[PDB]
Design an enzyme around this catalytic site. Structure first.
Site, PDB file in Angstrom:
ATOM      1  CG  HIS A   1      -0.663   0.208   2.498  1.00  0.00           C
ATOM      2  ND1 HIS A   1      -0.188  -0.811   3.304  1.00  0.00           N
ATOM      3  CD2 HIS A   1      -0.724   1.306   3.287  1.00  0.00           C
ATOM      4  CE1 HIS A   1       0.121  -0.321   4.494  1.00  0.00           C
ATOM      5  NE2 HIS A   1      -0.210   0.955   4.514  1.00  0.00           N
TER       6      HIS A   1
ATOM      7  CG  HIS B   1       0.124   4.290   4.798  1.00  0.00           C
ATOM      8  ND1 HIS B   1      -0.742   3.557   5.620  1.00  0.00           N
ATOM      9  CD2 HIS B   1      -0.592   5.341   4.338  1.00  0.00           C
ATOM     10  CE1 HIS B   1      -1.911   4.178   5.646  1.00  0.00           C
ATOM     11  NE2 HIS B   1      -1.841   5.261   4.901  1.00  0.00           N
TER      12      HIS B   1
ATOM     13  CG  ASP C   1       4.120   1.213   6.987  1.00  0.00           C
ATOM     14  OD1 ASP C   1       3.496   1.970   6.237  1.00  0.00           O
ATOM     15  OD2 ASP C   1       3.545   0.421   7.774  1.00  0.00           O
TER      16      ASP C   1
ATOM     17  CG  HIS D   1      -4.000  -0.207   6.907  1.00  0.00           C
ATOM     18  ND1 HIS D   1      -3.800   0.369   8.149  1.00  0.00           N
ATOM     19  CD2 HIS D   1      -3.001   0.241   6.119  1.00  0.00           C
ATOM     20  CE1 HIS D   1      -2.727   1.137   8.105  1.00  0.00           C
ATOM     21  NE2 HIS D   1      -2.214   1.061   6.891  1.00  0.00           N
TER      22      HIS D   1
ATOM     23  CG  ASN E   1      -2.804   5.688  10.623  1.00  0.00           C
ATOM     24  OD1 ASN E   1      -3.740   6.483  10.748  1.00  0.00           O
ATOM     25  ND2 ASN E   1      -1.941   5.748   9.608  1.00  0.00           N
TER      26      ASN E   1
HETATM   27 ZN   LIG Z   1      -0.416   1.918   6.311  1.00  0.00          ZN
HETATM   28 ZN   LIG Z   2       1.740   0.461   8.769  1.00  0.00          ZN
END
Ligand SMILES: [Zn+2]
Ligand SMILES: [Zn+2]
Length: 230
Positions: A83, A85, A87, A148, A179
């Site tokens: 995804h 993000h 990380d 998520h 989150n």
């Molecule tokens: Zn994420």
């Molecule tokens: Zn994450």
């Protein structure tokens, strides 16, 4: 013996062997005033390695490459970010400069662009609809639906029956969904059900953060998300 935050200083990467030719990588990073551990995956494909997700930043991802060369000694030739993000894509520039072909879905690439994150080079087509699945080297990539984030992908390794859930899946100790700024709480439990239905044979499930476990991580995630939504 799976490593936790307290065993990995920020800047260092550990590898953990899950199965023959399958490892997770574990890194730590500071975000909003707290240190978190983060997982990705490494899957052997002949004499080459497929990387799933960066180690959350440029320095971590450089360390990751160094640790892979030390411990495994095979080259990483392709990477997939699950995804948009940091990380997941933070460190993609390092990978690219190192000669690794980086990939993500068109949706992940667009959202990473919008958010000012690093952007994988190549688009993964065929993953736009919930339930979609595609082969990519030694793995199957699956889009379960929004959870998520709207773009989150999961990764199955058929040879080993290992399911890497990324952040669509929460560890068993988790009491909350974490989150959820980009999350779809109404859809998430349905997305998890799709994963349960599609990979009933999974023996190991690895979350985006925290300890791997068995299939119960899936139901637990649905339950936490439902309880969170309230
Ligand atoms: Zn994420
Ligand atoms: Zn994450």
């Amino acid at each position: 013996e799976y490593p936790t935050v307290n065993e990995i200083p920020v800047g260092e990467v550990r590898l953990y062997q899950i199965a023959d030719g399958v490892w997770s990588h574990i890194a730590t990073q500071s975000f909003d005033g707290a240190v978190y551990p983060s997982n990705g995956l490494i899957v052997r494909d002949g004499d080459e390695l497929l990387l799933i997700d960066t180690a959350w930043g440029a320095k971590n991802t450089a360390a990751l490459l160094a640790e892979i060369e030390k411990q495994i000694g095979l080259p990483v030739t392709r990477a997939v970010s699950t995804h948009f993000h940091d990380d997941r894509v933070g460190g993609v520039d390092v990978l690219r400069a190192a000669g690794v072909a980086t990939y993500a879905s068109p949706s992940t690439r667009r959202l990473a662009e919008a958010e000012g994150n690093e952007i994988p080079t190549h688009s993964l087509e065929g993953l736009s609809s919930s339930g979609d699945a595609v082969r990519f080297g030694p793995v199957e990539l699956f889009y379960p639906g929004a959870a998520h984030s709207t773009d989150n992908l999961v990764v199955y390794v058929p040879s080993a029956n290992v399911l890497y859930g990324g952040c669509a899946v929460l560890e068993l100790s988790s009491t909350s969904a974490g989150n959820v700024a980009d999350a779809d709480l109404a859809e998430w439990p349905t997305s998890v059900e799709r994963i349960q239905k599609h990979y009933p044979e999974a023996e190991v499930v690895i979350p985006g953060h925290g300890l791997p476990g068995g299939l119960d991580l899936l139901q637990h995630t649905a339950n936490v998300v439902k309880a969170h939504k309230n």
